[PDB]
Amino acid sequence: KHRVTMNEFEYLKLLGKGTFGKVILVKEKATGRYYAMKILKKEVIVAKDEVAHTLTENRVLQNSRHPFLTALKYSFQTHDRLCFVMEYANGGELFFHLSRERVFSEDRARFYGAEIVSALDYLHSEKNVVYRDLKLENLMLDKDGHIKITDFGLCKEGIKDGATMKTFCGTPEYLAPEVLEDNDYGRAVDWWGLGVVMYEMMCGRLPFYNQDHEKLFELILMEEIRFPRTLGPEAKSLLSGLLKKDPKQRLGGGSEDAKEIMQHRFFAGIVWQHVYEKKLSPPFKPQVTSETDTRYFDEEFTAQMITIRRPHFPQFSYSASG
């Protein structure tokens, strides 16, 4: 039982303006520790019908602990607002990094892929959660260069060995064929999402692209995958497995889930226990001088300065142990 308020934080820098609120680099007065605080106006959440997604995100963040999932330290509410105090990822979004570098080496994509697989294996097997929104923008880096997944509002809870989902949701460029078919789909949608992020990392483009979402969806449903002529055969076998359009043929589509991907020769020599204990060497270390250095966050936002109703959300509030 540790109740917290907006007064227990200093408000240092705007990290980013979200659709329904903003994310602010804050410092906890009592401890000196920095966090990213996500602040949503209740009026907005209710008017845009975001309440269910807000509560899902609260629940998944409370019920999850993993080194490559963003940790929730506190959630609390005011008369005005809902607040999530989260683990600050100083490294910014892999989207930032891949925009600057164009491609990652296969070894660098293998590292990020192993940390994503460990996170998703945990969500599916330990928590019965399907994430459904994997993409570069939700893959952040911590100060050491390890992955931190953010944005859990699109998760589905309570999904088991084979159980199915109906909600049409995700990001258009990342949607699995079985989601676009609008039949029921299972946890394998996450593995299609892995394939798309890993393809982008190693190939420097989406596997399917058109600006128009409807033609983009015809490519995802109909076009056969191609690869650049430089891509290694283990990389090409992994991406071809992950980007099978029929989820029952997909790598990770069977009852073994993530263990089938973990067994793939592209990950040969990876010790999954060592992945989890952060024993492996990040191939890129963010060059952040201090914790308030926001060089990996975009200019529009870092520059903006603001230095420092509606209902009650029953039992929203939470405080982590330790």
Binding site: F95, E137, F168, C169
Partner: peptide, 10 residues
């Protein structure tokens, strides 16, 4: 570099 994307939910 593709443009930044947003999620959706129906």
């Amino acid at each position: 570099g593709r443009p930044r994307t947003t999620x959706f939910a129906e």
